[PDB]
């Protein structure tokens, strides 16, 4: 089993966007020690204690050469996506 990637070392390569097929997709790059599991979560705005990210890519990792693609579904309304310390406000249509 992998350690969790250092949450300080992510950058957006593709910011959260609609996939076409009713999911949210994104891509990150990671500059730290590999390989590792990506810490990804999301919250409804104002409700920081309950994860709402439903991961379609279930155990996303940074491998020694690849990784960084993440796909998820989010509940309707105003959310915040986190990849490590990376944060993105996201409105999910009903």
């Amino acid at each position, epitope marked *: 089993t992998y*350690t*969790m990637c*250092d949450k300080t*070392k992510f950058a957006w390569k593709r910011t959260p966007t609609d996939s076409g097929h009713d999911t949210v997709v994104m891509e990150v790059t990671f*500059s*730290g*020690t*590999k*390989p*590792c599991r990506i810490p990804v979560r999301a919250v409804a705005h104002g409700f920081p204690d309950v994860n709402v990210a439903m991961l379609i890519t279930p155990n996303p990792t940074i491998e020694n050469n690849g990784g960084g693609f993440i796909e998820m579904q989010l509940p309707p309304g105003d959310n915040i996506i986190y990849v490590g310390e990376l944060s993105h406000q996201w409105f999910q249509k009903g």
Partner: antibody
Framework: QVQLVESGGGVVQPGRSLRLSCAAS????????MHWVRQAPGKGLDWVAV????????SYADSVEGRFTISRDNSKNTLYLQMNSLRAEDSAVYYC?????????????WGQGTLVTVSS | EIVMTQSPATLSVSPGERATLSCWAS??????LAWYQQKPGQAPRLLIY???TRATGIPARFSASGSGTEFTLTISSLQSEDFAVYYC?????????FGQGTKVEIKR
């Protein structure tokens, strides 16, 4: 001012166990990764183990896997290393080292080390 | 699984001269490479991280470069406190392994 103070070293007979601790002060301990590194007399630096800031992630050198356990107590600012089944080859100065980030090296601050001697 | 090798084993140079130390990785470690200084009887001190960035409190005569599999640490105008052992360390891949060290001594 960052300080790291190791303790628990001493003489231990082969096959037996020893717990080291490292008392941290002068920074927010619970924000960073912490490592152990060891150095046998006259030899080089030898990374031993890591624990992430939130204690969820741990990793070990192949030479100690299955025999050593790293843990930490964020409420007490203390890092631990449980060393079981010790061998002569584990004799070394054991250093407590801090990460500037959540888990990764490099090691921005080091303690003075505690001496472990595995001998009869 | 990544072997770090330093060269030379011992470098002998005079006060005020330049010392150039090499660190080789058996596979690319991108820029995730650190250098440390260790004086006899003391704990190590971080000098360089990210292959070329000086750590805090490190003076300008220490500089370092490289990427991939070859790295260099250069100590310009060696001063008395500069003579020590230097270690590199790759942290691109778990586990983050040290080189065996290069001793910099005074040539007289």
């Amino acid at each position: 001012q960052v300080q790291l103070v190791e303790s628990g070293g001493g003489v231990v007979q082969p096959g037996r166990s020893l717990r080291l601790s490292c008392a941290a002060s002068g920074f927010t301990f619970s924000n960073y990764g912490m490592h152990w590194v060891r150095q046998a007399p006259g030899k080089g630096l030898d990374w031993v183990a890591v624990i992430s800031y939130d204690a969820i992630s741990k990793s070990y050198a192949d030479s100690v896997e299955g025999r050593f356990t790293i843990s930490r107590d964020n409420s007490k600012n203390t890092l631990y290393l449980q060393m079981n089944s010790l061998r002569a080859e584990d004799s070394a100065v054991y250093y407590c080292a801090k990460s500037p980030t959540a888990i990764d090296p490099p090691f921005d601050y080091w303690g003075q080390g505690t001496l472990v001697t595995v001998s009869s | 699984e990544i072997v770090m090798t330093q060269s030379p084993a011992t470098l002998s140079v005079s006060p005020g001269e330049r010392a150039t130390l090499s660190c080789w990785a058996s596979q690319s470690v991108s820029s995730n490479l650190a250098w440390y200084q260790q004086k006899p009887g003391q704990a190590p001190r971080l000098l360089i991280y990210g292959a070329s960035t000086r750590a805090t409190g490190i003076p300008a005569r220490f500089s370092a470069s490289g990427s991939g599999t070859e790295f260099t640490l250069t100590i310009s105008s060696l001063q008395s406190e500069d003579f020590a052992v230097y270690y590199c360390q790759q942290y691109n891949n778990w586990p983050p392994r040290f080189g065996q060290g290069t001793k910099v001594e005074i040539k007289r």
